[PDB]
Amino acid sequence: PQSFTSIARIGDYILKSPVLSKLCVPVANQFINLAGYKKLGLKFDDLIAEENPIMQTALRRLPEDESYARAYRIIRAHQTELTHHLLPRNEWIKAQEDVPYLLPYILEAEAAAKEKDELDNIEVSK
Amino acid sequence: SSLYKTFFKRNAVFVGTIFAGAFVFQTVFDTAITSWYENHNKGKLWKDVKARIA
Amino acid sequence: GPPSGKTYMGWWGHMGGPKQKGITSYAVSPYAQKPLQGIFHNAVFNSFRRFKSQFLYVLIPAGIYWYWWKNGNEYNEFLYSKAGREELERVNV
Amino acid sequence: GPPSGKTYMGWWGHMGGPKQKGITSYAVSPYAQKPLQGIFHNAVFNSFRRFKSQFLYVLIPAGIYWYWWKNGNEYNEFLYSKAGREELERVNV
Amino acid sequence: MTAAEHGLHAPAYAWSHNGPFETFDHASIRRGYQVYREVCAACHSLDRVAWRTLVGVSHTNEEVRNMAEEFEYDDEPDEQGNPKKRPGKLSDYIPGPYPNEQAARAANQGALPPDLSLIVKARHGGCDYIFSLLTGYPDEPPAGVALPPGSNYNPYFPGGSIAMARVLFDDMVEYEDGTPATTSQMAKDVTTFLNWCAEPEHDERKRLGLKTVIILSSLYLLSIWVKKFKWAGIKTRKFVFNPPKPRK
Amino acid sequence: MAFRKSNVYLSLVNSYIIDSPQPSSINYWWNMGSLLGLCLVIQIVTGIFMAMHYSSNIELAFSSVEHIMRDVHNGYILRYLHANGASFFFMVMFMHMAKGLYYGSYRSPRVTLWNVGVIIFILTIATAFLGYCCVYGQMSHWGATVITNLFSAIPFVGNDIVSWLWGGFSVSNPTIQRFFALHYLVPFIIAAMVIMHLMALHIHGSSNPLGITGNLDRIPMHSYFIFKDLVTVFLFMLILALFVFYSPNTLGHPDNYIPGNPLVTPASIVPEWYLLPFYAILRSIPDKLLGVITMFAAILVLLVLPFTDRSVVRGNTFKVLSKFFFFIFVFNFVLLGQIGACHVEVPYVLMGQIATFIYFAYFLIIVPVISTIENVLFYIGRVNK
Amino acid sequence: MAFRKSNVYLSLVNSYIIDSPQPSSINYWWNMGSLLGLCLVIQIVTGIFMAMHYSSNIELAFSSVEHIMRDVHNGYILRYLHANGASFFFMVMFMHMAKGLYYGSYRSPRVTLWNVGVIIFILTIATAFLGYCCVYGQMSHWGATVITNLFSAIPFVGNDIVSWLWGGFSVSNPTIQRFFALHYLVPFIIAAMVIMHLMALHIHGSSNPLGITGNLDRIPMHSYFIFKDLVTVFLFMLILALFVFYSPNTLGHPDNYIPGNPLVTPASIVPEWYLLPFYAILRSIPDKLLGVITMFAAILVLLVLPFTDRSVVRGNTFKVLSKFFFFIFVFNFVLLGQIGACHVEVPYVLMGQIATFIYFAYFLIIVPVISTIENVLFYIGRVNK
Ligand SMILES: CCCCCCCCCCC(=O)OC[C@H](COP(=O)(O)OC[C@H](O)COP(=O)(O)OC[C@@H](COC(=O)CC)OC(=O)CCC)OC(=O)CCCCCCCC
Ligand SMILES: CCCCCCCCCCCCCCCCCC(=O)OC[C@H](COP(=O)(O)OCCN)OC(=O)CCCCCCCCCCCCC
Ligand code: HEM
Ligand code: HEM
Ligand code: HEM
Ligand code: HEM
Ligand code: HEM
Ligand SMILES: COc1c(O)c(C)c(C/C=C(\C)CC/C=C(\C)CC/C=C(/C)CC/C=C(\C)CC/C=C(\C)CCC=C(C)C)c(O)c1OC
Ligand SMILES: COc1c(O)c(C)c(C/C=C(\C)CC/C=C(\C)CC/C=C(\C)CC/C=C(\C)CC/C=C(/C)CCC=C(C)C)c(O)c1OC
Numbered sequence A: 001p002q003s004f005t006s007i008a009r010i011g012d013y014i015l016k017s018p019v020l021s022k023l024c025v026p027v028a029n030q031f032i033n034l035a036g037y038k039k040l041g042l043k044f045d046d047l048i049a050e051e052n053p054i055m056q057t058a059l060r061r062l063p064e065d066e067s068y069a070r071a072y073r074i075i076r077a078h079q080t081e082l083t084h085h086l087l088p089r090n091e092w093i094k095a096q097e098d099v100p101y102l103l104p105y106i107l108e109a110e111a112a113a114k115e116k117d118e119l120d121n122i123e124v125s126k
Numbered sequence B: 001s002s003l004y005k006t007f008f009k010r011n012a013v014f015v016g017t018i019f020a021g022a023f024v025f026q027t028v029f030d031t032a033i034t035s036w037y038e039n040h041n042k043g044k045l046w047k048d049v050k051a052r053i054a
Numbered sequence C, D: 001g002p003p004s005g006k007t008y009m010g011w012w013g014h015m016g017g018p019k020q021k022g023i024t025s026y027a028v029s030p031y032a033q034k035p036l037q038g039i040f041h042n043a044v045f046n047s048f049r050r051f052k053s054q055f056l057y058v059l060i061p062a063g064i065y066w067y068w069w070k071n072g073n074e075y076n077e078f079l080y081s082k083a084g085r086e087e088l089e090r091v092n093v
Numbered sequence E: 001m002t003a004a005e006h007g008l009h010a011p012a013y014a015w016s017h018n019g020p021f022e023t024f025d026h027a028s029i030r031r032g033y034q035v036y037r038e039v040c041a042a043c044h045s046l047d048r049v050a051w052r053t054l055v056g057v058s059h060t061n062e063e064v065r066n067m068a069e070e071f072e073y074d075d076e077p078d079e080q081g082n083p084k085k086r087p088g089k090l091s092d093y094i095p096g097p098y099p100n101e102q103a104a105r106a107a108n109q110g111a112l113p114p115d116l117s118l119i120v121k122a123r124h125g126g127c128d129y130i131f132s133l134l135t136g137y138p139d140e141p142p143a144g145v146a147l148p149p150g151s152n153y154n155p156y157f158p159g160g161s162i163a164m165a166r167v168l169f170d171d172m173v174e175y176e177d178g179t180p181a182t183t184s185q186m187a188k189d190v191t192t193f194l195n196w197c198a199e200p201e202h203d204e205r206k207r208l209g210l211k212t213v214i215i216l217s218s219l220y221l222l223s224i225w226v227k228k229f230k231w232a233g234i235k236t237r238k239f240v241f242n243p244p245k246p247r248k
Numbered sequence F, G: 001m002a003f004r005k006s007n008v009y010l011s012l013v014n015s016y017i018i019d020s021p022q023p024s025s026i027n028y029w030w031n032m033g034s035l036l037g038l039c040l041v042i043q044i045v046t047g048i049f050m051a052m053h054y055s056s057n058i059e060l061a062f063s064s065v066e067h068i069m070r071d072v073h074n075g076y077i078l079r080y081l082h083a084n085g086a087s088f089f090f091m092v093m094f095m096h097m098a099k100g101l102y103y104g105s106y107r108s109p110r111v112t113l114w115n116v117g118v119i120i121f122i123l124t125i126a127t128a129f130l131g132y133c134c135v136y137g138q139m140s141h142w143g144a145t146v147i148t149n150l151f152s153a154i155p156f157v158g159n160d161i162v163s164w165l166w167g168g169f170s171v172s173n174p175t176i177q178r179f180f181a182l183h184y185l186v187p188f189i190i191a192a193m194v195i196m197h198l199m200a201l202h203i204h205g206s207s208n209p210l211g212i213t214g215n216l217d218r219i220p221m222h223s224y225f226i227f228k229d230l231v232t233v234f235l236f237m238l239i240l241a242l243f244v245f246y247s248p249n250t251l252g253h254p255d256n257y258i259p260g261n262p263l264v265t266p267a268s269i270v271p272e273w274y275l276l277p278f279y280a281i282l283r284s285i286p287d288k289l290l291g292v293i294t295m296f297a298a299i300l301v302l303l304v305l306p307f308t309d310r311s312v313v314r315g316n317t318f319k320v321l322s323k324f325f326f327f328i329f330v331f332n333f334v335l336l337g338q339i340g341a342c343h344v345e346v347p348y349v350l351m352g353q354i355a356t357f358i359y360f361a362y363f364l365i366i367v368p369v370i371s372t373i374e375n376v377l378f379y380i381g382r383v384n385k
């Protein structure tokens, strides 16, 4: 309920600022490995809750080859959590494979439903 | 062994051993826990105080 | 019967997850493996690993609040003494 | 939800009757016709035709039993009279 | 609240019925009814204890049929409707010493003495307080404390001022079995007896608990095993993923 | 097909306790749902067998509870199972709404599950208060006075609801007689609201502690979570069996064995422990009208939680900052229970006002700010630009 | 889709009372199910508001029914709406078990619906009896003495069951005080067996008075049978209001206003008027052990009715002989409700033995014989050979 168009507006203002990118990006990746979702073998866009129609849409537009890997890292995390273990250190998602692979499919299916609500609510002048 | 064929094979005789094994567990475990509880408290019960009234 | 709305869980066969392919799962019968094979080395070595991660979130929220409680429950017994009645008559007044 | 058994009633659309074809069903709105259009001549002439059919199925089961109850309740009151104590001594014992 | 208005903390004595496997001392209840009758039956009712519960706990069957026939209860009236009395039986309760509440207040300078059926469960401390109340009376109260006329001091009562005077003095009763009746020996014996009167199940509540904790913790180690048995096919599942042919 | 799916009644048993697809990775915190179902039956089966000996008049209320504990065979078992099995109702239920806060089980599509949760939580606070008032001890009489005198602060309709609840002018024989016939009833409203609570759960299934979809790896309920729920049934029946047989009057109050006397106030007039953190909220507002509202808005602030959780991932499992501030709240609910059992003295009158603000700024300030800083830190930690 | 279909709760309301396709030919006998749902809420709501004033001891039972009728505002309304409404429960239900016995609603595929009927009928007999013994009148003490002494006929387990059932050695304070907490409860078991009775109906739908398939012409429930039920709701409310305000003690016995005295027996102990047929079956057998069985067999002989009806046509609508012999059974059932009121006198013992043979030879002898003759006459009337 945050709407990724919004956090990409606050995020890309932080990345472009040279003062804030020196300051709070080292806090950002320290927050990531402390969160510990890589240790179960998950990229971050596996975690985004998939029960709203703006994100259930962007899971159909995903290609077939990435929607088979994503259906494996979830079952590899359901299996690792019910043994109450962690994945071994040669199976953790590294810092470079953690890519926003579902961000462009969300941002194009979120800004195409913001546009639908700016078209049921137009007050056209005479 | 052949313990499986006589006891655990037919469920009609498996659960008939649970009930015949609980009928012995009721009578024995209750007597074994009463005869310990009074023996641990020897000298405080009324059956001993009635013996001091001589 | 009557229909119902869309859900996010179906039943066995049409559960409604994504189509999966090329993921194969092996499992052995539990009559053929020893249950509780690893009670030791998990109650000792794995239970420390779980306790090392999630204890610093259950000690500092209980170290902030228990130091706060013990610094007031000790303050309450000061002003209700013979030594702190002159501080009591200005706080309630 | 799980699939259930085979029942003899469905819902709107797949009710499970026989396939019907060539049955036209004209009907007028109730706002355009008069209710209570025939409340008289149905309370007199129709309600006599219903009574004419189903009354020998109610009266003869109540003309066998009410005659049976009354012919015992007046024999019970004969035995407990002054005139029927010489008969009560031979049937109560 | 001030420590004076809270009462002194009654300490932790070593009672013979503490612990989980111990029962009451039934020679300390039989010596603890005698201190109830000869000392505090003057001004304390015991209105929830029937005479039949003393049978087999601390007195025999003939010792209670000769203790209930000392008092007198209301029989059903005679064939002219006059009220009449009868000697007591085993199905009656222990009679209080005052007929109503106002007779109780008039005899003890306004203060109604509480009924001692549940007095150990209804006080903060249990029997550690009822014992230490009775032996907690100083010879003279501390300096500066102004007692009202007709109120005794002991610190273990909440407030400091109590209405009961110091009642247990040495050798005021003579026990049947030849026990030295001191102030601490008598105060231990009623406090066991008043503990019995509020908890007549304490012998059998603690031995039904021995049956239950033994069963319901050997039903818990067994149910851990059958969980680990039935979940062995899931906790050792193995997934391998080789990605399919991308031409499809 | 199978008979367990073809019968009209067994298809409800099959789809709920036998073939219900549960996610495979749910831990032991999901056993609190089956514990509350067991702990509701204990409060009903030992309620009927205890209401066959209970006379509800005000002169025979407290004397019939002692008739249960002294005269009825195994009456000490039946009452102590009922007084300690009701404290264990509110300890499993407090660990069931804390699993819900932690693992994000209030978010969509399960908002209609959270809302029937707060309705069942209200009808159980109501039932444990009516049943406490049926014993008519000195904490049970004087507890009914202070609670039902709060409704005399409703503007212009105040004194006519209070004098309608009491059935008179104070807590009397019309009150205890109606607080028993009401208290007998409401567990047959809870037992019909739990059926309205399993229905809202069954359309979307249980969540799971990762906050990702569980539609991929499901396992059935029968022979997998039957025997996992049987581990904590036999543990709940073990920590109950220490608090019934070996230490039964530890959770209760000692003053409740003094009979109900309306002419003497006790020293500290305090309801039973679980209603304590809703008593340091009521007592911290220095006003009578707002103190009733703030106590009633301490349960209805649980409804703004689906709309104030701004996190885009579900649950606190993979979050650092919103996992610390959860336990700040949980050890604030405990402190708020302790301020409710201390006297109205300095500095507890200030502790109870800060620790009420933290109860009402978790749901309205701390959650919708920390779960926004986390959504930005997940984004800018990976997206290099 | 519509919100009445898309919600988890409202689709249970939608599929049962709004969109449920009822056959478009059902007459006014199909309203007795909707009346019993209303007549159950009347007993339950006028049970809660009456049990806030009722003390259940043997000393304060009859004195606190009169406290309701004299001291409570509109208390005479509650006690009379609920003592007469319970006698209107059994008159609507006897017309509900006789619609289904006439129109063939017991036959397959509705044997599951019929068996939950006999289970609801047994709990309703047991509910209305257990509340009758709560007034502690003279007919209710000696009603409970005569009924619960029938279980002293079971061999070697007789006296231990009765002395467990009385809770003592005779009908005393623990019997009346447990006949209230039971009688409070069993309505909530009837209110759950009714939900288990609509589920058995909803899978195959209602029948129709012709006995043919009703899948062709179906009209909804909303605004058609909602407003066909509001006719008979407002009529049942009218005939109840005559029997509550204008003649309230017509149905009950006059001896129930004597306070119950175990030392003086009344002239003739009878139950309330609806248990009077089964009391005449119990009294007909000159043996005590067979009487308890046959009075219980007379409710369980309704279960052999789906297997003894040998007709290929559903219901008695188009049958000459099986419509005549049905009304002999109904007016035999009224006669058994009359021999139950007379004393044990000549000739009401030869009548009560013959008119209990016709109760049992209807299901076992008459219905299989006259429905085989009603199938050869349907056949050889049309086939020409
Ligand atoms: C006072 C009133 C209470 C009334 C309610 C009675 C029931 C209380 C239950 C509390 C609870 O549910 O906590 C569960 C907690 C988290 O579970 P998890 O899935 O994250 O851990 C996986 C485990 O290895 C499964 O291991 P596994 O399933 O293979 O073995 C069974 C396990 C069962 O243990 C329990 O049920 C909890 C005691 O056997 C044992 O290891 C016991 C050996 C003596 O279990 C844990 O392992 C503890 C982790 C820290 C939590 C601290 C709890 C403090 C409140
Ligand atoms: C009206 C509103 C009601 C609100 C309720 C108020 C709070 C009631 C108190 C209930 C206590 C419940 C504690 C929270 C339980 C749910 C949270 C939980 O399950 O803990 C799990 C947590 C970490 O587990 P993970 O799920 O993150 O593991 C995945 C690893 N990759 O594991 C941990 O971090 C440790 C868990 C330790 C639990 C500590 C409980 C403290 C109990 C209070 C003690 C009071 C006396 C001091
Ligand atoms: C073995 C002897 C006795 C025992 C165990 C005993 C027990 C008790 C107890 C437990 C209390 C309650 C104190 C409290 O509420 O904190 C009490 C109070 C009282 N007792 Fe005693 N009692 C004894 C002897 C007596 C006697 C002989 C009298 C005669 C006058 C007496 C008069 C009172 C009164 C008036 C109170 C009420 C005091 C108050 O409420 O302030 N007691 N007693
Ligand atoms: C969710 C359900 C219930 C809860 C949480 C609950 C809780 C309580 C509590 C806390 C008490 C006070 C016990 C004490 O302090 O002495 C009590 C008393 C009582 N309850 Fe319940 N109760 C529940 C259901 C029932 C039911 C269904 C009955 C059915 C008759 C019942 C009958 C009683 C009776 C008769 C008492 C007074 C006797 C006693 O206190 O032991 N309760 N209840
Ligand atoms: C009588 C009280 C209750 C009963 C019998 C009950 C029953 C259940 C059961 C059986 C489950 C499924 C097991 C599980 O998911 O843990 C469940 C889940 C749940 N309950 Fe309760 N519940 C009760 C009270 C509550 C309350 C008071 C709340 C919240 C205020 C609540 C909120 C939830 C939620 C959110 C879930 C879903 C958790 C998830 O699936 O992730 N329940 N309930
Ligand atoms: C199917 C539902 C019910 C039926 C058939 C039923 C029937 C009866 C009957 C026949 C009586 C005796 C009336 C008399 O002779 O004066 C009675 C009395 C009574 N019933 Fe019910 N009842 C039902 C439900 C309830 C419920 C749900 C409650 C309580 C919550 C209740 C509480 C009482 C009470 C308190 C009496 C008091 C005695 C009196 O004033 O009549 N009943 N009931
Ligand atoms: C509290 C008592 C009862 C309630 C609330 C109840 C409820 C209902 C309702 C609402 C219907 C649908 C309306 C109708 O078909 O008339 C129905 C149908 C039926 N009921 Fe009941 N019922 C009760 C007792 C009984 C009993 C005692 C029997 C039989 C022994 C019974 C047998 C049937 C049958 C056979 C039907 C289906 C008739 C048909 O639709 O063809 N019910 N019930
Ligand atoms: C097949 O189509 C149908 C059909 O689907 C249905 C539902 C019905 C209707 C039948 C029913 C509704 C029967 C169901 C009956 C119940 C479920 C009984 C439940 C009744 C109750 C009254 C529940 C109990 C709840 C209370 C008593 C709460 C009231 C609160 C009280 C008394 C306390 C008041 C205290 C204060 C402080 C206000 C039909 O008649 C019908 O055929 C047309
Ligand atoms: C989602 O998957 C599920 C799930 O589907 C379910 C159902 C449960 C289990 C939850 C429950 C069972 C809660 C529901 C609770 C109820 C419906 C309460 C029911 C209890 C009653 C209605 C009261 C019981 C009353 C009786 C049995 C009447 C008999 C009692 C007495 C005293 C009669 C005495 C008389 C004589 C003559 C002896 C889960 O835990 C669960 O997660 C695994």
Ligand SMILES: CCCCCCCCCCCCCCC(=O)O[C@H](COC(=O)CCCCCCCCCCCC)COP(=O)(O)O
Pocket: G034, G035, G037, G038, G041, G223, G226, G227, G229, G230, G233
């Ligand atoms: C719950 C136990 C069973 C009770 C049996 C009652 C069955 C009949 C229920 C009648 C409800 C009528 C609502 C229909 C409706 O709203 O249609 C509404 C409008 O109907 C009306 O305006 C009717 C006027 C109000 C009638 C008031 C009746 C109250 C009497 C209550 C007696 C029963 C408790 C929609 O009708 P439409 O779709 O044709 O436009």
Ligand SMILES: CCCCCCCCCCCCCCCCCC(=O)O[C@H](COC(=O)CCCCCC)COP(=O)(O)OCCN
Pocket: F006, F007, F008, F009, F010, F012, F013, F195, G108, G109, G110, G111, G112, G115, G116, G119, G192, G195, G196
């Ligand atoms: C708290 C209840 C609230 C509502 C929830 C409903 C959940 C109910 C769960 C009950 C589980 C136990 C029910 C088992 C019954 C299965 C037997 C059965 O259905 O066979 C039924 C017959 O049922 C009966 O005769 C009596 C049922 C009374 C049940 C009283 C408890 C026949 O089954 P069948 O579908 O094959 O019918 C063939 C038609 N000739």
Ligand SMILES: CCCCCCCCCCCCCCCCCC(=O)O[C@H](COC(=O)CCCCCC)COP(=O)(O)OCCN
Pocket: F111, F112, F115, F116, F192, F195, F196, G006, G007, G008, G009, G010, G012, G013, G195
């Ligand atoms: C034994 C079972 C007893 C009978 C239980 C089944 C029959 C119950 C009938 C209940 C009818 C009244 C319920 C109407 C409420 C519908 C509103 C609704 O569902 O909205 C729910 C939210 O519900 C709640 O918050 C509280 C509901 C508690 C109900 C307490 C009575 C939202 O519904 P939804 O998820 O479809 O939202 C779509 C977004 N536009």
Ligand SMILES: CCCCCCCCCCCCCC(=O)O[C@H](COC(=O)CCCCCCCCCCC)COP(=O)(O)O
Pocket: E208, E211, E212, E215, E216, F041, F042, F045, F077, F237, F240, F241
């Ligand atoms: C029906 C709700 C009852 C739930 C009880 C759960 C609370 C645990 C404490 C129980 C103590 C009461 C029993 C007792 O005192 O026995 C005591 C023995 O302890 C036990 O056996 C406890 C075993 C519990 C097994 C749980 C299975 C429940 C199946 C229910 C099927 C209807 C005394 O037994 P005794 O009178 O000496 O024969």
